[PDB]
Amino acid sequence: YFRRQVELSTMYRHMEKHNYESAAEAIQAVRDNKLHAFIWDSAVLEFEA
Amino acid sequence: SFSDCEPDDNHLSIVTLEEAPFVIVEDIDPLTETCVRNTVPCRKFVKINN
Ligand SMILES: *[C@@H]1O[C@H](CO)[C@@H](O)[C@H](O)[C@H]1NC(C)=O
Numbered sequence A: 001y002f003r004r005q006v007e008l009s010t011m012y013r014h015m016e017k018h019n020y021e022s023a024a025e026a027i028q029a030v031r032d033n034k035l036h037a038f039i040w041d042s043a044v045l046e047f048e049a
Numbered sequence B: 001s002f003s004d005c006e007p008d009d010n011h012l013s014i015v016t017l018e019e020a021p022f023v024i025v026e027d028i029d030p031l032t033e034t035c036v037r038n039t040v041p042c043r044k045f046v047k048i049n050n
């Protein structure tokens, strides 16, 4: 969805450094604050909240 | 003029200057060798040396 929209390709240029295999790795990284933001579905992150 | 009697005057030669608020000039996308379709192509004559 971020690759199709050509007007948001710049952010698509930035996310290439941290495209993680599983989201649990991103949750563990942001728990240790290795990351700063993560794009994901709403109810999953509300469950994590 | 693809034939003899074909007069047309619609191609418009356009020059511009590189200024970041208005004319962002970037390299071609190396993953595609194609500009992304919200952008336009351009060309520029660049010399070699002194
Ligand atoms: C010509 O080449 C020399 C190589 O030492 C370089 O210093 C100089 O900037 C070049 N000039 C141009 C106009 O490319």
Ligand SMILES: *[C@@H]1O[C@H](CO)[C@@H](O)[C@H](O)[C@H]1NC(C)=O
Pocket: B049, B050
């Ligand atoms: C090449 O020519 C330009 C022309 O003004 C000059 O400014 C530049 O210093 C030259 N490059 C050299 C001498 O390396």
